[PDB]
Design an enzyme around this catalytic site. Structure first.
Site, PDB file in Angstrom:
ATOM      1  NE  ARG A   1      -6.386  -0.785  -3.462  1.00 51.82           N
ATOM      2  CZ  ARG A   1      -6.299  -2.104  -3.316  1.00 51.82           C
ATOM      3  NH1 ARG A   1      -7.274  -2.879  -3.768  1.00 51.82           N
ATOM      4  NH2 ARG A   1      -5.243  -2.645  -2.723  1.00 51.82           N
TER       5      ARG A   1
ATOM      6  CG  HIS B   1     -19.324   6.382   3.093  1.00 52.72           C
ATOM      7  ND1 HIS B   1     -18.633   5.226   2.806  1.00 52.72           N
ATOM      8  CD2 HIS B   1     -20.345   6.023   3.906  1.00 52.72           C
ATOM      9  CE1 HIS B   1     -19.219   4.206   3.408  1.00 52.72           C
ATOM     10  NE2 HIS B   1     -20.254   4.667   4.089  1.00 52.72           N
TER      11      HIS B   1
ATOM     12  NE  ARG C   1      -3.637  -0.666   2.376  1.00 55.98           N
ATOM     13  CZ  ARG C   1      -4.637  -1.179   1.659  1.00 55.98           C
ATOM     14  NH1 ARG C   1      -5.237  -0.462   0.717  1.00 55.98           N
ATOM     15  NH2 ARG C   1      -5.032  -2.426   1.879  1.00 55.98           N
TER      16      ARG C   1
ATOM     17  CB  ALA D   1      -9.254  10.454   9.776  1.00 61.43           C
TER      18      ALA D   1
ATOM     19  CG  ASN E   1     -14.222   9.030   0.734  1.00 58.58           C
ATOM     20  OD1 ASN E   1     -14.017   8.648  -0.419  1.00 58.58           O
ATOM     21  ND2 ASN E   1     -14.951   8.330   1.604  1.00 58.58           N
TER      22      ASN E   1
HETATM   23  N1  LIG Z   1      -7.155   5.713   5.444  1.00 55.18           N
HETATM   24  C1  LIG Z   1      -8.341   5.927   4.686  1.00 55.18           C
HETATM   25  N2  LIG Z   1      -8.414   5.504   3.370  1.00 55.18           N
HETATM   26  C2  LIG Z   1      -9.539   5.730   2.715  1.00 55.18           C
HETATM   27  N3  LIG Z   1     -10.006   5.481   1.465  1.00 55.18           N
HETATM   28  C3  LIG Z   1     -11.162   5.856   1.204  1.00 55.18           C
HETATM   29  C4  LIG Z   1     -11.897   5.676  -0.137  1.00 55.18           C
HETATM   30  C5  LIG Z   1     -12.884   4.502  -0.026  1.00 55.18           C
HETATM   31  C6  LIG Z   1     -12.158   3.224   0.438  1.00 55.18           C
HETATM   32  C7  LIG Z   1     -12.874   1.984  -0.118  1.00 55.18           C
HETATM   33  C8  LIG Z   1     -12.602   0.755   0.785  1.00 55.18           C
HETATM   34  C9  LIG Z   1     -11.430  -0.096   0.241  1.00 55.18           C
HETATM   35  C10 LIG Z   1     -11.617  -1.555   0.728  1.00 55.18           C
HETATM   36  O1  LIG Z   1     -12.579  -1.776   1.430  1.00 55.18           O
HETATM   37  N4  LIG Z   1     -10.744  -2.678   0.419  1.00 55.18           N
HETATM   38  C11 LIG Z   1      -9.534  -2.732  -0.381  1.00 55.18           C
HETATM   39  C12 LIG Z   1      -9.726  -2.196  -1.775  1.00 55.18           C
HETATM   40  C13 LIG Z   1     -10.405  -3.200  -2.701  1.00 55.18           C
HETATM   41  C14 LIG Z   1     -10.724  -2.490  -4.003  1.00 55.18           C
HETATM   42  O2  LIG Z   1      -9.846  -2.385  -4.899  1.00 55.18           O
HETATM   43  O3  LIG Z   1     -11.872  -2.001  -4.187  1.00 55.18           O
HETATM   44  C15 LIG Z   1      -8.379  -2.017   0.276  1.00 55.18           C
HETATM   45  O4  LIG Z   1      -7.817  -2.525   1.275  1.00 55.18           O
HETATM   46  O5  LIG Z   1      -7.959  -0.921  -0.189  1.00 55.18           O
HETATM   47  C16 LIG Z   1     -11.654   6.427   2.233  1.00 55.18           C
HETATM   48  C17 LIG Z   1     -10.718   6.425   3.299  1.00 55.18           C
HETATM   49  C18 LIG Z   1     -10.614   6.828   4.592  1.00 55.18           C
HETATM   50  O6  LIG Z   1     -11.503   7.405   5.198  1.00 55.18           O
HETATM   51  N5  LIG Z   1      -9.427   6.627   5.281  1.00 55.18           N
HETATM   52  N1  LIG Z   2     -16.653   3.522   0.074  1.00 53.31           N
HETATM   53  C1  LIG Z   2     -16.783   4.603  -0.894  1.00 53.31           C
HETATM   54  C2  LIG Z   2     -17.978   4.430  -1.805  1.00 53.31           C
HETATM   55  O1  LIG Z   2     -18.760   3.495  -1.675  1.00 53.31           O
HETATM   56  N2  LIG Z   2     -18.108   5.351  -2.757  1.00 53.31           N
HETATM   57  C3  LIG Z   2     -19.256   5.389  -3.624  1.00 53.31           C
HETATM   58  O2  LIG Z   2     -18.972   4.838  -4.908  1.00 53.31           O
HETATM   59  C4  LIG Z   2     -19.808   5.464  -5.891  1.00 53.31           C
HETATM   60  C5  LIG Z   2     -18.950   5.953  -7.047  1.00 53.31           C
HETATM   61  O3  LIG Z   2     -19.769   6.406  -8.121  1.00 53.31           O
HETATM   62  P1  LIG Z   2     -19.141   7.296  -9.317  1.00 53.31           P
HETATM   63  O4  LIG Z   2     -17.938   6.507  -9.800  1.00 53.31           O
HETATM   64  O5  LIG Z   2     -20.285   7.395 -10.299  1.00 53.31           O
HETATM   65  O6  LIG Z   2     -18.760   8.601  -8.675  1.00 53.31           O
HETATM   66  C6  LIG Z   2     -20.485   6.640  -5.201  1.00 53.31           C
HETATM   67  O7  LIG Z   2     -21.817   6.270  -4.819  1.00 53.31           O
HETATM   68  C7  LIG Z   2     -19.650   6.820  -3.956  1.00 53.31           C
HETATM   69  O8  LIG Z   2     -20.338   7.459  -2.869  1.00 53.31           O
END
Ligand SMILES: Nc1nc2[nH]c(CCCCCCC(=O)N[C@@H](CCC(=O)O)C(=O)O)cc2c(=O)[nH]1
Ligand SMILES: NCC(=O)N[C@@H]1O[C@H](COP(=O)([O-])[O-])[C@@H](O)[C@H]1O
Length: 200
Positions: free
Chosen positions: A90, A108, A64, A140, A106
């Site tokens: 990610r 959500h 990462r 965060a 971000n």
């Molecule tokens: N430190 C931190 N990282 C962040 N990333 C995101 C943005 C949204 C993150 C999506 C979840 C990824 C996950 O659940 N699993 C995998 C990814 C798998 C994938 O490729 O979708 C991971 O460990 O990254 C928000 C946020 C946050 O508040 N804090």
């Molecule tokens: N954990 C974060 C998450 O779930 N994000 C969500 O992914 C979608 C992306 O749509 P888009 O590619 O059309 O913007 C959006 O609904 C966003 O809130």
């Protein structure tokens, strides 16, 4: 303020940010779009808007921290002030998050602190809420736990699926993410030294 938008997919939030940041009174300009995935629709949207794109495949990195370093290099290349995670899926490393503390937003698709994590609509439907929504927050280290900037409630209709609920919630996402970006880019909202949100 100079903005990078990070994406992993369709890019509807990216498009709403492109539209908003091009209005004359916008305090933000989008200078680079970064995807961790090739051939996603969000890249087409950026290209159509004449915005530079980079694909940084997380699969090609040992861990990462190395992946985040590759992102950070591009952010420095483009002298970025603010990062928007717009469907970027990610988890970011601690040091990267600390470096961009108060500078990274971000979106959500729940009313945090409910339904943290990757499948918020599935959770909302399983739980049986009649009101959900979306949240823009500062990023965060702990995922989906950073300081909330804006939120908008969205009703759950009986018979909703992820398809229909996500569609309804995205309409709200496209409102609050541009609004939140403008608040931060203009300096109206900042992350306070005490870690709490500060409206100036
Ligand atoms: N430190 C931190 N990282 C962040 N990333 C995101 C943005 C949204 C993150 C999506 C979840 C990824 C996950 O659940 N699993 C995998 C990814 C798998 C994938 O490729 O979708 C991971 O460990 O990254 C928000 C946020 C946050 O508040 N804090
Ligand atoms: N954990 C974060 C998450 O779930 N994000 C969500 O992914 C979608 C992306 O749509 P888009 O590619 O059309 O913007 C959006 O609904 C966003 O809130």
């Amino acid at each position: 303020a100079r903005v990078a938008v990070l994406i992993s997919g369709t890019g509807s939030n990216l498009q709403a940010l492109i539209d908003s940041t091009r209005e004359p009174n916008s305090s933000a300009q989008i200078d680079i779009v970064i995807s961790n995935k090739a051939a996603v629709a969000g890249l087409d949207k950026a290209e159509r808007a004449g915005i530079p794109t980079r694909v940084i495949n997380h699969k090609l990195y040992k861990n990462r921290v190395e992946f985040d370093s590759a992102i950070d290099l591009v952010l420095e290349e483009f002298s970025i002030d603010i990062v928007c995670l717009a469907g970027f899926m990610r988890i970011l490393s601690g040091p990267f998050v600390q470096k961009w503390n108060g500078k990274m937003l971000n979106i959500h698709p729940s009313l945090l602190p409910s339904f943290k994590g990757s499948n918020a609509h599935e959770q909302a439907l399983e739980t049986g809420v009649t009101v959900t929504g979306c949240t823009v927050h500062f990023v965060a280290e702990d995922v989906d736990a950073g300081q909330i900037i804006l939120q908008e409630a969205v009703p759950v209709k009986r018979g909703d699926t992820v398809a229909t609920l996500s569609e309804r919630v995205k309409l709200a996402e496209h409102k609050i993410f541009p609004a939140a970006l403008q608040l931060v880019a203009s300096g109206t909202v900042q992350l306070g030294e005490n870690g709490k949100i500060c409206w100036v």
